[PDB]
Amino acid sequence: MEMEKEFEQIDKSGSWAAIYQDIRHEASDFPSRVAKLPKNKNRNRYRDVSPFDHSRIKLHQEDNDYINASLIKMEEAQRSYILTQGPLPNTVGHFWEMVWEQKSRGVVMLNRVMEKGSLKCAQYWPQKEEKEMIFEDTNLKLTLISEDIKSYYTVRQLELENLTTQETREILHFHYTTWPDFGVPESPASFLNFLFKVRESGSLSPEHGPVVVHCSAGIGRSGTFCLADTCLLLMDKRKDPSSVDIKKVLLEMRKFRMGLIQTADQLRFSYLAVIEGAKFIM
Numbered sequence: 001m002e003m004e005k006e007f008e009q010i011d012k013s014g015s016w017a018a019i020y021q022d023i024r025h026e027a028s029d030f031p032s033r034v035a036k037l038p039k040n041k042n043r044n045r046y047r048d049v050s051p052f053d054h055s056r057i058k059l060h061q062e063d064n065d066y067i068n069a070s071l072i073k074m075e076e077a078q079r080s081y082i083l084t085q086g087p088l089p090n091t092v093g094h095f096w097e098m099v100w101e102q103k104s105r106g107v108v109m110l111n112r113v114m115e116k117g118s119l120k121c122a123q124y125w126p127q128k129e130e131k132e133m134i135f136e137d138t139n140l141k142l143t144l145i146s147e148d149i150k151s152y153y154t155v156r157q158l159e160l161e162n163l164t165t166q167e168t169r170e171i172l173h174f175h176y177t178t179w180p181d182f183g184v185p186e187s188p189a190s191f192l193n194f195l196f197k198v199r200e201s202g203s204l205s206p207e208h209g210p211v212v213v214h215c216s217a218g219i220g221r222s223g224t225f226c227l228a229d230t231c232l233l234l235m236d237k238r239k240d241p242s243s244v245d246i247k248k249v250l251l252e253m254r255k256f257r258m259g260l261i262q263t264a265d266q267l268r269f270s271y272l273a274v275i276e277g278a279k280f281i282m
């Protein structure tokens with residue numbers, strides 16, 4: 001079926017939970033043996049969210065190459081994304097090592113450091129120009145260059161230096177700051193505006209490594225971002241845009257990381273975002 005009328009049909013019939021459970025039943029199951037090794041326990045935030053072995057990002061290190069991160073490679077859309085958990089106190093150096101090694105231009109953050117009165121990720125970037133951060137375990141330096149605070153999101157320019165080679169690179173930090181503590185946003189307008197700002201920066205384009213996108217677990221809000229982006233790109237590329245099937249795209253993405261889209265409300269929100277976005281594109 002088309003999307004917008006399938007949407008009204010699920011709303012009128014109140015069957016979002018049944019649609020979402022079908023997706024959960026049909027989703028891929030692949031091994032995640034490296035994630036579950038005892039030496040990696042303090043490298044995982046949640047025991048039930050792990051990268052599959054076949055798609056995990058490897059750190060270029062011989063001691064321990066493990067990070068909780070996955071490469072989502074969308075062949076028809078010609079887009080790739082790295083989805084990862086919010087960094088932990090003992091993985092902030094690994095996180096920036098990955099950004100460096102994968103040649104990423106942008107980092108997309110969809111959570112606040114504290115939500116619901118608890119810490120959802122480490123404070124992993126510097127807040128003042130004159131107070132830079134040094135990650136001694138991976139030999140990197142990170143400096144805040146500029147910050148632009150808007151009503152729904154903040155963009156930061158960061159300088160990442162590989163202290164071993166003295167090479168430097170500019171990294172863009174795109175921080176969506178207004179996702180509610182509970183539920184999903186009422187309108188997708190600010191989320192779509194944010195997606196378009198990431199696109200306009202070059203951070204999603206083939207002349208760079210894959211964008212790094214995270215929330216707390218790296219599957220819910222993060223899944224919504226890449227699902228909406230890929231569906232909109234396919235609608236622009238194909239002769240028949242009504243042939244794009246959001247459930248099929250989501251199942252394809254779940255071949256590369258488990259659990260993408262965590263609730264039926266997130267699924268409904270993803271439909272809403274793609275529907276509204278397809279009208280603005282033209």
Ligand SMILES: CS(=O)(=O)NCCc1ccccc1
Binds near residue numbers: 090123134135
């Ligand atoms: C000392 S520093 O500020 O230059 N770098 C420390 C990296 C780190 C950041 C946040 C939480 C844990 C560790």
Ligand SMILES: CS(=O)(=O)NCCc1ccccc1
Binds near residue numbers: 145168169171
């Ligand atoms: C404003 S500036 O002169 O300090 N900017 C230089 C460009 C640059 C930005 C961020 C990271 C690396 C390079």
